[PDB]
Amino acid sequence: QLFSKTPSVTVFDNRGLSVRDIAYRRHPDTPKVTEECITYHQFDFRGFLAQSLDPRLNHKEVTNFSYLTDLNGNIIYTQSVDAGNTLVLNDTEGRSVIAMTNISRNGKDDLSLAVTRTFQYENAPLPGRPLSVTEQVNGENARITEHFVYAGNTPQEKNLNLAGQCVSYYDAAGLIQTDSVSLTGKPLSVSRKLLKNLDDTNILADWQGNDTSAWNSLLATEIYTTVTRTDAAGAVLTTIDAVGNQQRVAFDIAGQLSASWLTLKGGQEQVIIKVLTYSAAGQKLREEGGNGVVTTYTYEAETQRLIGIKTERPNGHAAGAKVLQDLRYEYDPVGNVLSITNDAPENAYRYDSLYQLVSASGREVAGAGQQGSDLPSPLVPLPSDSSVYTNYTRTYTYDSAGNLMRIRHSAPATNNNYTLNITVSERSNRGVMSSLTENPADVDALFTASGSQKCLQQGQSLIWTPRG
């Protein structure tokens, strides 16, 4: 097949590290050229990668990364033209101490946008575990985003198996008071309390000063605890979202799931399964939920490539024999799909030699229109019609580097044909559909110093925050 002679290679220095990527990539319908699908990788005298590039930047002669390191040569402060210069910093003992990102491009780059988080620990005699962490607003105030209140070793903490343990992760969105644990180490209950008003968008969830004697102003009335009981196998015996939801489960002679029953809030607990059949691989085979339908699934047993699935209401069902679906599916040597169909009319696919998708023709429902930032109305009721899902073609296109170009389409049943095209940065992954901007160099101005987008789908309001 023309797919032949597309191999991948790796090529090394005399240190023995691969100085480049190699593949051999062909667009199938223009088969004369195989791309220069290869790229630079560069490593220091410590054998640690200093650089690698998009080939499309190489003749442009502009670099893409920075890395900086210690004795023992671990990365410290590091940048790429998409990621921005970024730090997480750690103890001798590897404990985290501080985290920062969102620093500008002149080189005198502005750490007043550092978006800081930093970490706080036990003292002797205790081993030095993290009792807390705080946000710090870059260049400004720190606030204690959490505590991890470690227990003592009272007979109580023994009983609860909380000896030394975080009995109180006071946290963003409030507290989880870890308040019982098993001899099997599994937790047995924890009072998830929200904030004093969790739908208050601005109460801190930050835990400054002495103790919760203050933060009672900030933890919820919503004491939506969870409670748990456990098998010696560690599988759940029962668990209960203390607002009133609860669960139970049971298993076969070996350990596969055989049944479960799940209490909705304060209700009875009821089984989910009517009939069960797995494959010997433990994958499914023939099941009937409380739904009462026969469904079955059929696969390459060597690989579980599902060749198809069928569903009917069975003969003798409460609503009698009725086939509901019969899907069939097709696959390549490595196992990429190529087509699917169903009955109760077909769809089919193409890929680069890279397996980078290029085509996805099929059938799609009339009247849905060309896709926007929307969900249409459903067709209601469910069409018994043979046709309203009219046949169509759709296709994909992609950069030399890891970026898309376009989706391109025809709806010949309605002539509703169109193409989607992406504007993208001269120099980064920053890029969007060309009607936001057509300019592939204006487009890069639109993103934060951490490379998140400055504004929403069409410029609407958005704020990014700590934890990113």
């Binding site: 991948s8 480049r20 290869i38 402060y77 103890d91 920062m100 010696a232 196998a233 076969d252 490595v334």
Partner: protein, 1476 residues
């Protein structure tokens, strides 16, 4: 790190065995196999010996060929018999001569002394430290002498550089000497040792006695008592002492040691159904069937006791520290050992490990069998004529010797006008390697050959014959090479004798290889004086007048010989009548002992004659055997163990032939058997010659071993002399002049097969070699210059081709005169590879700044010793995979390995001591593509007086210049090869690693190898900077050095340590460490911080991330300090606490552990940490192992182990949000794990244990019983007895592994046997695991019933879980898949369904090729691999010779490709490989 947490046993495992350790070969050719010993580590240090067979080993208590003997200090005797005087010479157990040492000023290491370990001695005393002729490692050694030697004894002390210290010969049992007057000390023996912690081990010897002896032995051997046996080892002293105990008056009681190894020769009941006892009763140790003596130290050396059971004893309640009264130690475990016994030899049939249940039921490991080549003469075949020879003898028509380094002789009829017709053995064309014939003669230019005492021998010991000159006035010889080089005449200040009568000419007893002449007989002893073919004066002595007088030349129907019927190698005097025979004990210098008779012979004495008699040893022991002729037969009498003679064998002569006084018998190795085949001529008819057939092997070589897990060793073994004739023959087919520097015969291991016990796959391994070498002055095997090594796996198939390994290698023989030649042998398809690693030599001096060396050329004498010391050093190797390719001739890779020596002054002025170093490697990697290897070189630059690698470097090299086309296949787009080159290739890279140590070595101390300081720095350079041969060390040490320290390097890093205790961070006596020192940052690595921080925040972040300033090491002139951390903070008591861990820390920034001990500090009983979590454990001191734990929540976790010390069940119980929870306390629910898997297949939910497991390894052999067999044979059990005696069946009634074939051979027995066996398969070693779904607080524990299957070779085979009933495959009673007639699996409902997993077509490298699919099955039994091969889908792993799947094939035939090159690797998938 900190001292380990309280830790559970594994809680799991797999079925596996032990002793699985057959060794690889080497240029010595003396293949050997070793096994470790199944006994404890004590508290952490314990006796660490290990047993071995060797092809080259003699007899012992281990039986013939085996070895586990520990060590002693002893004389040489290859130099002949000891004087028992000052001028005798003595040897390390390291195998090297032990000179006296020299000081700085080149004076001896000696003094009078009056303390040791500061212990002021009970006397004035005298001491001398000692030095070997060769150092590998720098142990300090001293001899000890009373100032008046008669006052008690001298003795010996040992100081290893690691401080490990040992003593020899305080006590009689710790000594060996003349039993009559021990002033003739043979040896001093190891007796005790102390650890730096003041642990100890002691080593008992038992002396000889008359137990189980009898009248004949009593009459003959009233001298045995000096013999010794290693009867017990003991360890775990009741209380510490860092000095030796035996400094004391006398060693404390038996109770004061806690672990013991005990050795027994059949005293306690060998029955499997009796556990032995620490006390042995009074049955008394047996004496071997095949008893004999040695003589070689000039004394009686009777050899009698062989062990059969070895016993591990634990003083349990003292180990518990609980009780001490009558704490008779438990027999922890019993190694059991079984031998074949014969009138002349015994050696192991088998061994097995055993332990015991508390009810005393044994439990067993699989046995381990052996079968060395048994000499037998029921074997012996008939005669054949010798067309090759048929008339060339019969008095004068024969002449013979090997001259041409042959190992077997040329015939050479040769006279005064002598023909010199060197008719010599050549390989027959065709047939096997063993086929041989005698070809053309060759006369040669040669000596006067007349009237000279002109005769055959090498007399000087030269490996070259010395054709004798002794005529009227004229004396000397001419020496003849293997080349036929008749050297010029040799006058030598020879001092030959009068030869007055040639009668009674002595030869041997002077010493092996240096034979010398003494006319002698009754009442007097003339003396030799030959050294290496020169002489001192001869002398007169006599042996004592009571000794019987051997006497020569009286023809009165009798014979004499200098011949070793005793097989010592000393060709003892024997006198031989038709009725009586007598042999004199060798006493070497001037003497023999009173002679012993031998028995087992007579003839009708009135019918007898002298001669008609022949004397060759034929049993291969050395004990010369006897033949008589008879009117139509030969009578062959074989020597019982060197003591008596078997019933004579009656051999019919060839038909119609009768032997008579014309006829001449002889024995010589016709076929390359390595022992003499039979030979004769009857000079009656024109044809005259015959051989007789004998055997196909040299006897007593191990030949095969097995484990009852189903292992084998198909040992194959070949004459090195045949090898020489082959090397000769093939290089003469190459027309080259041959000259193997080994003339000397021995028979060596050669090849083996191994087999897949279940799949019937197999593998071949081959050992091959060239340039045989021997010492032309010392008579010593100098190795082979080249080795060649080869192998293949092989398979039952189905497409996969095997590709034989081939590799070639070179080793120093220490003889330039051939060592030079190997340079021809190196493959040079590659070309730009650099000059051969050239061996080099140096000497240390005490220069200022702590000394130096000069590399130098010493004398050629010195070089003799240098090269001999280098002998065996592995020089080079070159390695390939075999195929029809134009790269079969190209190796995957090649290596050469430079060696360098320091020569050393000595009290021996004749030669220096020396030591050697493998100072470099260089290593070219081709992937069998010759165009352009990657290569690297690694080198040591600097070292101390004790050779530490004070500086070293390593180098990688830039790529070769851009070639014009790809050598690789055109499958790659040319864009690959033409882009395969980069600026990054243009680069050389060079590590420097430099370091220095401490050396606490004054006075008593000898502490060496003490880590201290290290730094590394790096360079990179332009490819245009290096020389075309590459840089050598000798190059870049020069002042011009391109890498000169003025060049700006990269400082790679440093490291350091601080020792604790009172030596200023330098080591204390135990060298305990205060902390490890751990760098972080400097003005080079700050740049990340420079990107972000001010000075204050920078400094803060160092101090907060845990770092401090410290000095920078190997400081260069301008170099600032560096930021670092430090680690490991830990503390210990003294010896009174055995310096056990008290409390230990990783870092000051984090918590510290504290650890709590039993009274003996045997184990940490408890621990608590920084967070104060106290932890409990309790231990079974059978195995010193924790059966119990508790956490700080009071959660118990608990385990039990079998008496073999292996986990068998577990549970946990504790608290649960404050309720009590878990399983019961065990004593609250004492419980029985099912005894059998068939029982466990019906276990119930709710057992009080979280898990258990059950096992059957020995199931690989079928089990039988007396009643089972009697229900066929109805003798009701005497057959069962006979079979057990015959080792067909084990004592526990299994069929014995070799037994299976052993019996159907020895007694033929048939399907009569198969009746007991056939439908019970060999059942793979297997086990069932169980774990319980819930604590026994809930009875509805779902039962996780999973079986598993293992071997000794890949270990786990497969495993399966019981699963819910339904459609499944079915296994046949014949283990097949049950099939429909069309072969479809019997895919039908089963109740007993299994999910079956992990099966695959395993391989001998350890993987598997065909990864089989899993499935459902009905059965816990193993299904047939034949059916699996027929039916079951699997991808094929196409491993390369490096074991790397260059390809995989899917079960559906699509493929994944790869190929590897030194510079790059190509890869392809199932869609892309579809080029077909």
């Amino acid at each position: 790190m900190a001292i380990t947490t309280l830790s559970l046993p594994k809680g799991g495992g797999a079925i596996n065995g032990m002793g699985e350790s057959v060794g690889q070969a080497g240029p010595d050719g003396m293949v050997t196999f070793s096994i470790p010993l199944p006994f404890s580590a004590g508290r952490g240090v314990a006796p660490a010996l290990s047993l071995s067979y060797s092809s080259g080993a003699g007899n012992g208590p281990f039986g013939m060929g085996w070895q586990c003997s520990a060590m002693s200090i002893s004389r040489r005797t290859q130099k002949g018999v000891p004087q028992y005087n000052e001028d005798d010479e003595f040897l390390s157990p390291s195998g090297e001569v032990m000179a006296i040492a020299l000081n700085d000023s080149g004076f001896e290491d000696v003094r009078t002394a009056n303390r040791l370990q500061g212990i002021p001695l009970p006397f004035s005393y005298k001491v001398t430290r000692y030095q070997p002729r060769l150092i590998q490692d720098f142990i300090k050694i001293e001899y000890w002498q009373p100032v008046k030697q008669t006052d008690g004894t001298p003795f010996w002390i040992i100081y290893s550089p690691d401080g490990q210290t040992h003593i020899l010969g305080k006590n009689s049992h710790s000594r060996v000497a003349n039993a009559e007057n021990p002033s003739q000390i043979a040896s001093w023996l190891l007796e005790e040792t102390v650890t730096p912690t003041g642990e100890h081990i002691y080593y008992q010897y038992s002396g000889e006695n008359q137990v189980n002896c009898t009248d004949a032995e009593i009459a003959l051997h009233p001298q045995d008592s000096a013999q010794r046996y290693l009867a017990r080892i003991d360890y775990g002293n009741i209380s510490p002492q860092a000095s030796l105990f035996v400094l004391d008056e006398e060693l404390p009681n038996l109770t004061q040691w806690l672990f013991h190894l005990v050795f027994d020769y059949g005293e306690r009941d060998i029955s499997i159904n009796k556990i032995p006892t620490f006390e042995g009763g009074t049955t008394g140790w047996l004496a071997r069937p095949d008893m004999f003596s040695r003589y070689d130290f000039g004394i009686e050396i009777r050899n009698r006791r062989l062990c059969h059971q070895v016993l591990g004893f634990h003083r349990l309640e003292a180990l518990n520290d609980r009780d001490v009264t009558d704490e008779i130690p438990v027999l922890v475990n019993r190694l059991t050992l079984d031998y074949d016994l014969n009138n002349s030899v015994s050696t192991l049939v088998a061994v097995r490990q055993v332990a015991y249940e508390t009810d005393g039921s044994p439990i067993t490991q699989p046995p381990l069998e052996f079968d060395y080549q048994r000499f037998d003469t029921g074997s012996i075949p008939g005669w054949q004529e010798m067309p090759q020879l048929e008339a060339f003898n019969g008095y004068q028509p024969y002449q013979m010797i090997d001259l041409y380094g042959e190992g077997t002789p040329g015939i050479l009829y040769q006279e005064t006008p002598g023909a010199w017709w060197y008719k010599s053995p050549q390989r027959q064309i065709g047939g096997d390697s063993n086929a041989v014939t005698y070809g053309a003669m060759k006369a040669l230019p040669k000596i006067p050959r007349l009237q000279e005492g002109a005769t055959l021998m090498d007399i000087n010991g030269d490996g070259r014959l010395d054709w004798v000159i002794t005529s009227a006035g004229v004396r000397g010889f001419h020496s003849i090479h293997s080349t036929g080089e008749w050297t010029h005449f040799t006058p030598l200040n020879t001092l030959p004798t009068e030869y007055f009568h040639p009668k009674a000419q002595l030869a041997d007893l002077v010493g092996a290889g240096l034979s010398d002449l003494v006319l002698i007989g009754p009442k007097s002893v003339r003396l030799y004086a030959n050294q290496q073919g020169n002489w001192a004066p001869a002398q007169d002595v006599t042996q004592a007048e009571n000794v019987s007088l051997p006497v020569i030349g009286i023809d009165s129907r009798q014979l004499v010989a200098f011949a070793d019927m005793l097989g010592s190698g000393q060709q003892h005097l024997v006198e031989i009548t038709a009725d009586s025979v007598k042999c004199w004990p060798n006493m070497g210098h001037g003497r023999f002992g009173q002679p012993l008779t031998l028995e087992g012979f007579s003839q009708p004495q009135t019918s007898f004659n002298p001669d008609r008699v022949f004397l060759a040893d034929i049993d291969g022991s050395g004990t010369n055997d006897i033949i008589y002729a008879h009117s139509e037969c030969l009578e062959i009498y074989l020597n019982e163990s060197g003591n008596r003679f078997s019933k004579p064998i009656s051999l019919l002569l060839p038909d119609g032939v009768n032997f008579d006084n014309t006829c001449q018998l002889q024995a010589a190795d016709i076929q390359g058997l390595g022992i003499a085949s039979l030979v004769m001529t009857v000079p009656h008819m024109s044809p005259t010659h015959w051989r007789c057939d004998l055997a196909l092997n040299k006897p007593w070589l191990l030949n095969v071993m097995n484990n009852n897990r189903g292992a084998e060793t198909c040992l194959f073994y070949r004459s090195s002399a045949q090898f020489w004739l082959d090397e000769k023959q093939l290089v003469e087919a190459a027309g080259q002049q041959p000259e193997c520097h080994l003339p000397f015969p021995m028979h060596l291991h050669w090849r083996s097969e191994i087999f897949d016990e279940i799949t019937g796959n197999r593998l071949t391994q081959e050992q091959e070699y060239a340039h045989g070498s021997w010492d032309g002055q010392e008579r010593e095997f100098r190795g082979f210059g080249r080795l060649i090594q080869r192998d293949t796996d092989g398979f039952a198939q189905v497409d996969i081709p095997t590709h034989p390994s081939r590799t070639v290698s070179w080793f120093a023989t220490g003889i330039p005169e051939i060592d030079t030649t190997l340079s021809a042998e190196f493959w040079r398809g590659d070309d730009q590879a650099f000059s051969p690693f050239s061996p080099r030599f140096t000497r240390w001096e005490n220069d200022s700044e702590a000394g130096s060396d000069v590399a130098f050329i010493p004398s050629e004498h010195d070089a003799f010793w240098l090269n001999r010391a280098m002998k065996g050093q592995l020089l080079r190797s070159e390695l390939y995979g075999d195929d029809g390719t134009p790269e079969a001739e190209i190796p995957y890779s090649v290596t050469e390995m430079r060696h360098q020596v320091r020569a050393l002054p000595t009290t021996d002025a004749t030669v220096p001591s020396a030591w050697c170093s493998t100072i470099e490697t260089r290593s070219y990697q081709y992937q069998r593509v010759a165009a352009d290897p990657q290569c690297s070189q690694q080198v040591v630059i600097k070292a101390d007086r004790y050779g530490s690698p004070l500086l070293s470097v390593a180098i990688n090299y830039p790529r070769r210049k851009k070639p014009e086309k790809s050598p690789y296949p055109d499958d790659l787009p040319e864009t690959l090869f033409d882009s395969s080159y980069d600026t990054q290739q243009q680069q050389l890279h060079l590590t420097k690693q430099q370091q220095n140590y401490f050396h606490l070595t004054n006075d008593d101390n000898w502490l060496l190898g003490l880590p201290k300081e290290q730094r590394n720095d790096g360079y990179q350079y332009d490819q245009e900077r290096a020389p075309a041969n590459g840089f050598t060390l000798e190059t870049l040490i020069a002042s011009n050095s391109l890498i000169g320290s003025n060049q700006p390097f990269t400082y790679l890093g440093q490291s350091r340590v601080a020792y604790q205790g009172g030596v200023d961070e330098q080591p204390s006596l135990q060298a305990l460490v205060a902390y490890g020192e751990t760098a972080i940052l400097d003005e080079k690595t700050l740049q990340a911080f420079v990107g972000v921080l001010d000075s204050k925040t920078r400094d803060e972040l160092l101090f907060s991330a845990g770092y401090q300033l410290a000095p920078r090491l190997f400081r260069v002139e301008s170099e600032p300090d560096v930021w670092v951390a430090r680690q490991g903070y830990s503390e210990f008591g003294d010896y009174s606490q055995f310096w056990r861990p008290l409390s230990q820390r990783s870092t000051l920034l984090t918590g510290k552990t504290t650890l709590k001990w039993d009274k003996h500090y045997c184990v940490v009983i408890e621990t608590q940490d920084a967070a104060q979590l106290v932890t409990q454990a309790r231990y079974d001191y059978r195995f010193l192992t924790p059966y119990s734990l508790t956490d700080a929540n009071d959660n118990q976790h608990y385990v039990v182990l079998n008496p073999f010390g292996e986990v068998i069940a577990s549970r946990f119980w504790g608290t649960e949000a404050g309720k009590d929870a878990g399983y019961s306390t065990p004593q609250a629910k004492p419980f029985v794990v099912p005894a059998t898997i068939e029982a466990a297949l019906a276990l119930s939910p709710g057992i009080p244990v979280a898990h258990c497991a059950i096992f059957e390894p020995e199931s690989w052999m079928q089990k039988l019983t007396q009643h089972d067999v009697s229900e066929r044979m109805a003798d009701n059990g005497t057959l069962w007895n006979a079979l057990l005696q015959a080792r067909f069946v084990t004592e526990d009634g299994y069929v014995c592994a070799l037994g299976r074939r052993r019996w159907m051979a020895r007694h033929g027995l048939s399907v009569l046997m198969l009746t007991l066996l056939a439908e019970i398969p060999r059942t793979p070693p297997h086990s069932l695991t169980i774990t319980t779904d819930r604590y026994d607080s809930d009875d509805q524990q779902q039962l996780r019933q999973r079986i598993l299957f293992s071997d000794g070779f890949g270990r786990l085979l497969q495993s399966a879980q019981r699963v819910e009933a339904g459609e499944s495959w079915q296994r046949s009673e014949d283990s097949s898949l049950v099939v429909n007639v069309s072969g479809t699996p019997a895919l039908v409902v089963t109740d007993n369904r299994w999910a079956v997993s992990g099966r695959t077509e395993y391989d001998g490298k350890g993987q598997g090729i065909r990864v089989y699919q899993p499935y459902f099955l009905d059965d816990w039994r193993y299904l047939s691999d034949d059916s699996a091969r027929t039916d079951l889908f699997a991808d094929t792993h196409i491993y390369d010779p490096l074991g790397r799947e260059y390809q995989v094939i899917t079960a559906k035939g699509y493929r994944r490709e790869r190929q590897y090159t030194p510079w790059f690797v190509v890869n392809q998938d199932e869609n892309d490989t579809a080029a077909n």
